[PDB]
Amino acid sequence: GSLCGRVFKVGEPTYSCRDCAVDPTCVLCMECFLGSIHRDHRYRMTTSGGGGFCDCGDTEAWKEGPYCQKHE
Ligand SMILES: [Zn+2]
Ligand SMILES: [Zn+2]
Ligand SMILES: [Zn+2]
Numbered sequence: 001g002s003l004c005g006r007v008f009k010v011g012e013p014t015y016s017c018r019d020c021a022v023d024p025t026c027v028l029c030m031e032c033f034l035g036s037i038h039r040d041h042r043y044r045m046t047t048s049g050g051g052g053f054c055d056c057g058d059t060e061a062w063k064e065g066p067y068c069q070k071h072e
Pocket of ligand 2: 004031032056057067068069070071
């Protein structure tokens with residue numbers, strides 16, 4: 001219920017839950033991933049080359065658990 005929305009900087013890890021992502025571009029930042037249900041799911045970590053943004057709290061990006069503990 002609050003906004004992460006943050007942009008990724010070069011080198012930062014991004015996390016896409018394989019079980020819950022609507023498509024492979026759906027990603028959580030490290031803080032949101034580790035505070036979400038998806039930390040216990042199958043996931044893809046991809047290092048950012050810069051750009052994009054965290055999808056925490058976008059119900060269109062996730063089949064379940066769209067919000068991490070901080071942003072719910
Ligand atoms: Zn985030
Ligand atoms: Zn979050
Ligand atoms: Zn998941």
